Amino acid sequence: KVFGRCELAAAMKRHGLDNYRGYSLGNWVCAAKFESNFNTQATNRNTDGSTDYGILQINSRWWCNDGRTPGSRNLCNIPCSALLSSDITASVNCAKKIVSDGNGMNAWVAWRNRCKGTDVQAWIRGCRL
Ligand SMILES: OCCc1ccccc1
Ligand SMILES: [Cl-]
Ligand SMILES: [Cl-]
Ligand SMILES: [Cl-]
Ligand code: NA
Numbered sequence: 001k002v003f004g005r006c007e008l009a010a011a012m013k014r015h016g017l018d019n020y021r022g023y024s025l026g027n028w029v030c031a032a033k034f035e036s037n038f039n040t041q042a043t044n045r046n047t048d049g050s051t052d053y054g055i056l057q058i059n060s061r062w063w064c065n066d067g068r069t070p071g072s073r074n075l076c077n078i079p080c081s082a083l084l085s086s087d088i089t090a091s092v093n094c095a096k097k098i099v100s101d102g103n104g105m106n107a108w109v110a111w112r113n114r115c116k117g118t119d120v121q122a123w124i125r126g127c128r129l
Contacts, residue, residue: 001039001040001041001086002037002038002039002040003032003038003040003055004038005029005033005038005123005127006124006126006127006128006129008029008032008038008055008088009025009026009029009123009124009127009129010127010128010129011088012025012028012029012032012088012092013025013129015088015089015092015093016092016096017092017095017096018129020096020099021096021099021100021104022104023099023104023105024120024121025123025124025129026120026121026122026123026124027105027111027115027120028056028095029120029123029124030111030114030115030118030120030123031056031105031108031110031111031115032055032056033123034110034111034114034115035052035055035056035057035108035110036054036055036056036057038055039055040054040055040083040084040085040086040088040091041054041084042054042055042057043084044057046059046061048061049068049069049070050069050072051066051068051069051080053066053080053081053083053084054083054084054085054088054091055083055088055091056083056091056095056108057108057110058076058080058083058091058094058095058098060072060080061073062075063075063076063094063097063098064076064078064079064080064082064083064094065078065079065080066079066080066081075097076090076093076094076097078090078094
């Protein structure tokens with residue numbers, strides 16, 4: 001599914017991301033834009049042979065099982081395929097664990113490089129929520 005901007009903002013707020021670990025909703029929307037273009041089916045292979053999955057490009061190196069990332073962990077206790085669903089529940093639940101792991105949203109290098117320190121409220125401007 002490719003979400004609209006405000007549609008995704010809504011969905012993320014319903015699933016409890018607004019101000020989760022102190023990160024306003026616009027931070028989450030900005031990260032999803034640059035990670036996936038709001039496409040739940042996004043995947044990208046990393047250099048090490050891990051894969052990033054879904055709207056927030058969650059990495060099989062640590063967070064999910066895809067059976068093809070030697071040595072990796074599955075800390076969210078899910079198949080990586082769950083992160084590609086039209087329903088963002090699994091992605092959100094796993095993101096809450098990631099953002100809680102000490103580095104905050106710096107876990108997402110694209111957030112650090114493209115969202116952090118910008119006017120992230122622009123991503124939810126106009127949205128009914
Ligand atoms: O942008 C990297 C590409 C990628 C996506 C899914 C599986 C392998 C590769
Ligand atoms: Cl915001
Ligand atoms: Cl594996
Ligand atoms: Cl933090
Ligand atoms: Na894994």
